[PDB]
Ligand binder design. Structure first.
Ligand SMILES: Nc1ncnc2c1ncn2[C@@H]1O[C@H](COP(=O)(O)OP(=O)(O)OP(=O)(O)O)[C@@H](O)[C@H]1O
Ligand SMILES: Nc1ncnc2c1ncn2[C@@H]1O[C@H](COP(=O)(O)OP(=O)(O)O)[C@@H](O)[C@H]1O
Ligand SMILES: [Mg+2]
Ligand SMILES: [Mg+2]
Lengths: 229, 78, 246, 236
């Protein structure tokens, strides 16, 4: 086969150029500065954060961050036009970076990430909240199925915060992994999220739970019969 | 662990074991008397914290220990 | 019995591995990198010492063999490096003796690091490069520390190397330097006594710095001045490079 | 209405969309030549043109206009500076239009145009930096240059896509809006290697670690040439 194909080694893409051109196309006055601050930031987080199996800071993560930054910039523009011109673009990128990276991080790496954010973007700050209706529906479902709800500093605060992060990931993402040790509230978290989303938006939620290691791969995807196709 | 304790106590106070009732009243009384040990640190959390450094045959998981405990307490109510 | 010889070598091994201090609230990138590296080194030391003590007890004493102990004993007798300890890069599968020597040297370096941190003073400590778990993280923390100390941009810093933090253990390959001027030599490798890493905002021969002789793990890139009669194309053809461990 | 067989009228639909895209591209590139003959351009008529034509047609018409203008300048450094200034003012009006609020489809078309025009601006800047006199220099032959011949008797063969020693015809497949890729120099090297392989009637096998740009660059080249690209996820 090797003589029938021409090989090209792709290992180093120009992340800086990709970020700069894509932010310029999305619409950002300080596009070059934002790219030159956001690509070395991912390079910094690649090493100075702790090493984990579920961590990733590659081109897919960078492009997800930039696309979400464009989306939240557009929705903030719509909100201001409801209530334009100069906008906090650095705050927009900070919001996108937090919304995409913070749920992935281990509890000992959140202060490190926020220190890196304060290092790269000095006037960065943060804004988390304004999910009152979903929080109330979550409290209703948690009280319904004998679960405890927390306000952020109460007993269930970390669990409810992780449920909200899961909701954000479902909103701005495509496929999900809930990584955690056995007994961390993953199943209850996504179950109450599905029920609360059903209660809010009216659309019924259906969940198919498949164990991929209890069946063979041929029973998981399918087979072609060798005799007849 | 106090979240799991609260879940066990709530599912004991409601949803009686038979698929108000005298059994439900017995469950409520048992939950009322077991609340001080489960809540805060108490006996159970200190016992778990000590039992984690005791050597076992299979690897010890707090949810396995608490599932055993909750089933035994349901048997006590029965 | 091979068990007696294995127990003798096993008792010989951990005399070069005794204890590491775990050393913790500072925003310096150098201290952050050093504390994560020392915590992973302490975890690795604890795992290795526990494994060695377990094999000592199971061989020269009374202890029932487990499956993990059987696998560990088989790997130790075979002389291949067990996969349970290879938590960093090793050159092309070194033997257990070489791995233990390198690990003991790294632990001595970490003990010196912990002593200096206890006494910040981490700016001027002369630190090697091959003995670090992640030298790339050390170079990145170097760049961040100089950028924070001088308060300019991190992305517009060039590297100038003069033979400013002290790096030791580097070795050239196929050339030697005479007062910051590279000269072609027929020697296999020439050591480097002292290297400082200055940072400036804005015929020079630029050379790679690989992790070991395998030339597979590039760490960073240095710049050097050429001799009067030598040629950069000659340097590139001869494949002169710098290694962090040789 | 005559009710032919389903495959028969589906084949008729396929041929009709191909010839429709060819005719639309011809009139579009006529409009672009009319627009870009002048130096300064009007944002209102530019936005009406954007809304008038489809996304792949506007991107490809901009590519044709830039390629023809830069080849005319190379045939003859003053005209090369003129075409660089034209590209720069097009970037300016595109940036103003994308800063203003637009409907989503027009916004996507503007984003694609901004990406392509940034790539053209970078190529023209490099071509200024090098001292290029004639159009046969490999420093210009390396880039993907587009040729439109209005005198061709066939509508489907009017456009010829060229690389360094490679002749291609546009497939004229309706692709939707897709997603233009930022023209990395790695992507340009990929385009050069893959077009060389296709001219040699071979395959193409980019390789490397995950999350580098292999599948997306193959798909982007396929969409640039206007082909139907199907990605198959192989397993045992
Ligand atoms: N908010 C909560 N309040 C009280 N108890 C809770 C709460 N969330 C979970 N639990 C308890 O935690 C137990 C652990 O089950 P859970 O479904 O959360 O595990 P998991 O994270 O999916 O684990 P596994 O990886 O083993 O599947 C549940 O049986 C439930 O009783
Ligand atoms: N030149 C480019 N411009 C914009 N985005 C790019 C470019 N190259 C790669 N990407 C993005 O990087 C990610 C890489 O994914 P992909 O290339 O599909 O993975 P792989 O090729 O390793 O299978 C994609 O989401 C793609 O959108
Ligand atoms: Mg579960
Ligand atoms: Mg792919």
């Amino acid at each position: 086969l090797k003589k029938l194909f021409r090989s090209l080694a792709m290992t180093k893409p120009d992340r800086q150029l990709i970020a700069q051109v894509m932010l310029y196309s999305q619409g950002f006055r300080t596009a070059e500065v934002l790219a030159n601050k956001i690509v070395p930031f991912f390079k910094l987080c690649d090493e100075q954060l702790s090493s984990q199996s579920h961590y990733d800071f590659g081109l897919r993560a960078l492009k997800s961050v930039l696309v979400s930054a464009g989306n939240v910039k557009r929705e903030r523009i719509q909100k201001i036009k409801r209530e334009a011109e100069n906008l906090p673009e650095q705050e927009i990128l900070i919001q996108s970076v937090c919304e995409t990276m913070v749920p992935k991080l281990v509890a000992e790496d959140i202060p490190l990430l926020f220190s890196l954010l304060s290092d790269v973007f000095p006037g960065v700050q943060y804004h988390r909240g304004e999910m009152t209706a979903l929080r109330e529906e979550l409290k209703k479902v948690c009280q319904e199925m004998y679960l405890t709800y927390g306000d952020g500093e109460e007993v269930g605060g970390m669990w409810v915060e992780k449920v909200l992060q899961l909701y954000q990931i479902t909103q701005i993402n495509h496929g999900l992994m809930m990584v955690g040790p056995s007994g961390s509230g993953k199943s209850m978290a996504w179950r109450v999220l599905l029920k609360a989303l059903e209660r809010l938006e009216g659309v019924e939620g259906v969940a198919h739970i498949i164990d991929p290691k209890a069946i063979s791969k041929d029973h998981l995807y399918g087979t072609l019969d060798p005799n007849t196709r | 662990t106090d979240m799991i304790f609260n879940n066990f106590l709530a599912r004991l106070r409601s949803i009686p074991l038979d698929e108000a009732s005298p059994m439900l009243q017995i469950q409520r009384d048992a939950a009322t008397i077991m609340q001080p040990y489960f809540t805060s640190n108490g006996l159970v959390t200190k016992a778990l914290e000590h039992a984690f450094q005791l050597e076992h045959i299979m690897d010890l998981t707090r949810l396995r220990c608490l599932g055993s405990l909750f089933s035994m307490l349901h048997q006590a109510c029965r | 019995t091979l068990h007696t010889t294995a127990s003798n070598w096993l008792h010989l091994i951990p005399q070069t591995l005794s204890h590491l201090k775990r050393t913790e609230n500072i925003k310096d990138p150098l201290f952050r990198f050093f504390e994560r590296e020392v915590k992973m080194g302490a975890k690795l030391l604890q795992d290795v010492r526990q494994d060695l003590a377990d094999v000592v007890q199971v061989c020269e004493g009374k202890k029932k063999q487990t499956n993990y102990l059987r696998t560990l004993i088989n790997e130790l007798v075979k002389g291949i490096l067990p996969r349970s300890w290879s938590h960093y890069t090793v050159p092309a599968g070194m033997t257990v003796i070489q791995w233990v020597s390198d690990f003991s040297e790294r632990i001595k370096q970490l003990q010196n690091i912990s002593l200096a941190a206890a006494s910040k003073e981490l700016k001027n400590i002369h630190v090697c490069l091959g003995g670090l778990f992640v030298p790339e993280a050390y170079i990145t923390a170097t760049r961040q520390y100089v950028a924070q100390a001088n308060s300019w941009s991190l992305e517009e810093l060039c590297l100038e190397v003069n033979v400013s933090f002290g790096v030791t253990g580097l070795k050239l390959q196929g050339a030697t330097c005479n007062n910051n001027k590279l000269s072609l030599s027929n020697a296999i490798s020439t050591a480097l006594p002292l290297t400082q890493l200055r940072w400036v905002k804005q015929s020079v021969v630029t050379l790679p710095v690989y992790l070991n002789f395998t030339r597979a793990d590039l760490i960073f890139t240095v710049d050097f001045e050429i001799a009067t009669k030598e040629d950069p194309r000659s340097f590139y053809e001869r494949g002169v490079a710098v290694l962090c461990t040789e | 209405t005559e009710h032919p067989k389903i495959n028969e009228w589906l084949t008729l639909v396929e041929k009709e969309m191909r010839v429709t895209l060819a005719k639309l591209l011809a009139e579009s590139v006529t409009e672009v030549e009319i627009f870009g003959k002048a130096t300064s351009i009007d944002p209102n008529t530019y936005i009406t043109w954007i809304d008038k034509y489809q996304a792949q047609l506007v991107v490809l018409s901009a590519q044709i206009a830039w390629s023809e203008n830069v080849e005319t300048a190379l045939s003859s450094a003053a005209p090369l500076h003129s075409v660089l200034s034209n590209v720069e003012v097009t970037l300016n009006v595109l940036a103003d239009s994308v800063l203003m609020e637009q409907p989503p489809l027009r916004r996507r078309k503007l984003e694609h145009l901004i990406t392509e025009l940034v790539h053209q601006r970078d190529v023209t800047r490099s071509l200024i930096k090098s001292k290029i006199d004639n159009a046969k220099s490999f420093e210009w032959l390396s880039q993907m240059r587009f040729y439109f011949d209005p005198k061709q008797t066939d509508v489907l063969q009017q456009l010829s896509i060229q690389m360094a020693n490679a002749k291609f015809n546009y497939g004229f497949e309706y692709l939707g809006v897709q997603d233009k890729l930022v023209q990395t120099p790695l992507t340009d090297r990929c385009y050069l290697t893959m077009t060389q392989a296709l001219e040699a009637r071979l395959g193409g096998s980019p390789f490397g670690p995950a999350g580098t740009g292999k599948t997306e660059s193959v798909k982007a080249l396929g969409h640039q040439l206007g082909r139907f690209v199907l990605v198959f996820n192989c397993d045992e």
